[PDB]
Amino acid sequence: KETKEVYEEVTELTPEENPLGGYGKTISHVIVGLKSAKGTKTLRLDPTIYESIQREKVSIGDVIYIEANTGAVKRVGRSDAYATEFDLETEEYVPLPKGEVHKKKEIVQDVTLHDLDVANARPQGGQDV
Amino acid sequence: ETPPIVIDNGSYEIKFGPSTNKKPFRALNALAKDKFGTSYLSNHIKNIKDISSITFRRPHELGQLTLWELESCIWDYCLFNPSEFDGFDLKEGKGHHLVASESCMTLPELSKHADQVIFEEYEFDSLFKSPVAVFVPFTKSYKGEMRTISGKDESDYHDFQLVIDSGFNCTWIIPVLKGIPYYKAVKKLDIGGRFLTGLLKETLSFRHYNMMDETILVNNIKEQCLFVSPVSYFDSFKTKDKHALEYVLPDFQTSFLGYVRNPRKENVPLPEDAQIITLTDELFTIPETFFHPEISQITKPGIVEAILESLSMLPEIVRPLMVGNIVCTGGNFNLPNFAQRLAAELQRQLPTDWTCHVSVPEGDCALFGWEVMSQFAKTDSYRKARVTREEYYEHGPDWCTKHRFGYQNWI
Amino acid sequence: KALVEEIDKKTYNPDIYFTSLDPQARRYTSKKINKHSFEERYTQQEILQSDRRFMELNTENFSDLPNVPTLLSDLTGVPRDRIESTTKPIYGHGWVLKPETLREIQLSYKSTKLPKPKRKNTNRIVALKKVLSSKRNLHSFLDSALLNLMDKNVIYHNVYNKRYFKVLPLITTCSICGGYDSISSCVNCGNKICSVSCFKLHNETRC
Amino acid sequence: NKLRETNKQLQEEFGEASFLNFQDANQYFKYSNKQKLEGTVDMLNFLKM
């Protein structure tokens, strides 16, 4: 078992102070606001998760899935209420997340020791060729 | 006569009654004359046999009332016809006080007109007029039924309040603090009973045969066969095929008023000769215009934007307090699922930290406000807040409308 | 794309792709081809048209259709000349003062009555008589100096919004019916249409 | 522990009338104390996490 927190409609985001050192380009922090269903909230977050967002390349009117445990953002998609802006759109619009934006939850999974052995023997991580 | 007479003057219908009673006396505030010239008083409009072609005139306009002649005559009618309105009986009302409810955005000149017409002709002794808003805080004085619905989940008068009225004329949202309402964060929505009836006319004209001369049918249909989208516009559209109502034209030869039927129920299997209008989409699309005025291609912001901006004008310390206790007032709010829908919408808009709750009085809010005003007459703070005849005489009519009940004073 | 394609080096705009059956072979912009507040997205003419449609929805009878210029002038202080020139719209009329109803109301309360005289003859009484025979229009209220200009300021701009005109997204569904899927704009009229029957009903009169 | 000391002293001082949500809805001072205690509870939970 493992307990995790998560945050889930994106309202707005602002990236970023003076270098005052060896920082050629400085992005101190990024402010992001989420809407959800049971109320909205804004927060501040690291530049690294901002670069992760840029890798995801999400828009401003979107719904995302950010897990603060691993600092990874997943683009759930567009917002359903933001439909009919254009007559066509390939991406599935997807409804808005239900409940509180800041979700505390716990998960329970059953595995076997052979699964751990296989995972360690043949790791799937890696970005190089 | 210790107990005053409470008059909630409505643009559509007025509620006159003694402070003793628990229910108001309902009398129409209008004038409809048949095309042949035989006019009929406001209370006698309901007894007429034809409603197809009438000429209408309502003394109360969008803002307020200007010509006091019809209102004075109607006030005398509800004040000098003990036979038509049983129980009530009065000679002069000399020692009788007056408790009235008039809007906070009244014209100072028109407020002076109202004060002079109520005092210097009928010979009152004590008056008190204030908007229906301030009296609702007095709901903590007397026990009553008050359904509080939580937005998030699936002295005696209360200083903290923020109340919305939605009657026939228009809609008004007021913040009340310390028992003294704020007169700047107040926001007016033009969608009232008139505008909903007009939208009903236009949308039936988009669907079924026209009735634009026949507006009483429009009002009856609006009061009867509508229901607010419980969840969303699209999902309520998914119920248009399965759910539908059918209204029948009122045949003046047979029945002065029509009826609405549901095909599921077989309790009314009687066939009828007249034509039947099917309403399958306009039941729920019509109430949606408050949240989506652009359906009728208007530049009007909307209810949620209005309440959000009105909160924005309020000081930050008092902002979270108002949403924690919201009371629903007005005859438009009797539409089913409206309170829950608006609660869900504004709670979704408002951030997570503060949870907003909406209090609904069961049934219509008009009689709820009337019994609240009757309790205010019962409430002894009215004794300390009242005025007398000598105060009116020693000063001019301008002082009474510019100092005590004046709105710029409380700004 | 298919590898190796022939180009003639003329035009060759990688972001401009125009293709048709060539019935006119003309760009819609070749040479300017011609001849968040909602007050910004919709221009002054459009917001004024929305306003006059709003006021024309206010009325409940035929007689107040020519009363629309008077009501709109009372609302926003525009002369009736431009109301009749640029809006491009789609005794019962003169307030309730008919003497016929005045003498007919006697039969309304004739069931029981016990009137008595208690009155004087003063300036207040004269003003009461004037109010009783009121016969006044909102235009007369506003043109005259009986109401302070600060009262006008706090009655007109205490209602309007100025910065946030929309907080929820717009559904933008067809005008005739409510087909929520596969909506599209019309060829000429530029109004959203959904169904075949909707297009047939719209192309005649609305388009 | 630093937050818990303040939380427990606040709960001891006014833990009888400020606990109910009925008084939280109708308040000017007590609702602020309830907000402070819930905020410090959330803060300590986040710190433990």
Ligand SMILES: Nc1ncnc2c1ncn2[C@@H]1O[C@H](COP(=O)(O)OP(=O)(O)O)[C@@H](O)[C@H]1O
């Ligand atoms: N149960 C109901 N369902 C729908 N509409 C209603 C219902 N009851 C009353 N109404 C509408 O509310 C309006 C009454 O407004 P009212 O309280 O008279 O405003 P005012 O006090 O400004 O005259 C009527 O136009 C009526 O159509």
Ligand code: BEF
């Ligand atoms: F006078 Be009301 F109830 F708008």
Ligand SMILES: [Mg+2]
């Ligand atoms: Mg009223």
Ligand SMILES: [Zn+2]
């Ligand atoms: Zn259509």
Ligand SMILES: [Zn+2]
């Ligand atoms: Zn078209």
